[PDB]
């Protein structure tokens, strides 16, 4: 064992490595969305900016878990980052719905990690998760739900002005 390791179960170490991969995957999905909105036949610059910001945030989430793994004396093992499920995200509304689904799946993973940390009596890891991840995920999910609600009410994607005006007012 590492000279720093204390109260850090092998199952937690493995679960953190899984979470690192999931956050890197989420970053890649957001990047894919961002570059869809930069296409000349889509051309919604503030949707593109919004998803690029989310991509960079997910990267920061992954890097903070890497720092945690080393702080606790675990060892980082990286895996392939799978490509996103689609190249064409269809519409601003569809991308926001897909983002909401993704954020909820990441939250579910974090709740399973917290349950594991609780079961292994690892309060530092429980607190880490609560302080830096759970907080943030609830806020993200609520923001995406609000965006989906507004776009649907405005008539997106069939009402042509809806995504245009949402891009200007809400995301601009």
Task: Pick what 75 binds: its own copies, Zn ion, none; C-beta below 5 to 8 Å, kind-dependent.
Answer: its own copies
User: How is residue 57 written in tokens?
Assistant: 């945030």
Nearest CA-CA partner of 74 in 16, 154, 18, 145:
16
* DSSP state, residue 82: P
Residue 75 binds its own copies, judged by CB under 8 A: yes
Q: Do the beta carbons of residue 31 and residue 129 sit within 8 Å?
A: no
Residue 11 binds its own copies, judged by CB under 8 A: no
Nearest CA-CA partner of 94 in 41, 158, 43, 25:
158
User: How is residue 10 written in tokens?
Assistant: 């092998």
Q: Do the beta carbons of residue 145 and residue 151 sit within 8 Å?
A: no
Chosen residue from 9, 18, 28, 57 binding its own copies by CB under 8 A: 28
Residue 10 binds its own copies, judged by CB under 8 A: no
Judged by CB under 8 A, the chain residues 32 through 51 that form the site for its own copies are 32, 35, 38-43, 45
Total residues contacting its own copies by CB under 8 A comes to 77
Chosen residue from 11, 14, 53, 123 binding its own copies by CB under 8 A: 123
Q: Which residue is nearest to Zn ion (CB)?
A: 61
- Consult the annotation and say whether 137 binds a ligand: yes
Nearest CA-CA partner of 22 in 98, 103, 100:
103
C-alpha torsion sign, points 57, 58, 60, 65:
positive
Residue 53 binds its own copies, judged by CB under 8 A: no
Judged by CB under 8 A, the chain residues 92 through 121 that form the site for its own copies are 100, 104, 107-108, 111, 114-115, 118, 121
* Residues annotated in a binding site for Fe cation: 23, 58, 61, 103, 137
């Amino acid at each position: 064992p590492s000279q720093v390791r204390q109260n850090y179960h092998q199952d937690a170490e493995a679960a953190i490595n899984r979470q690192i991969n999931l956050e890197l995957y989420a970053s890649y999905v957001y990047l894919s969305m961002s570059c869809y909105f930069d296409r000349d036949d889509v051309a919604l610059k503030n949707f593109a900016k919004y998803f690029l910001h989310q991509s960079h945030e997910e990267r920061e989430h992954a890097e903070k878990l890497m720092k945690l793994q080393n702080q606790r004396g675990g060892r980082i093992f990286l895996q392939d980052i799978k490509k996103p499920d689609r190249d064409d995200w269809e519409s601003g509304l569809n991308a926001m719905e897909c983002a909401l689904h993704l954020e909820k799946s990441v939250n579910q993973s974090l709740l399973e990690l917290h349950k594991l940390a609780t079961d292994k009596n690892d309060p530092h890891l429980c607190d880490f998760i609560e302080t830096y991840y759970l907080s943030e995920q609830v806020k993200s999910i609520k923001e995406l739900g609000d965006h989906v609600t507004n776009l649907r009410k405005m008539g997106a994607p069939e009402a042509g002005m809806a995504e245009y005006l949402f891009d200007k007012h809400t995301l601009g």
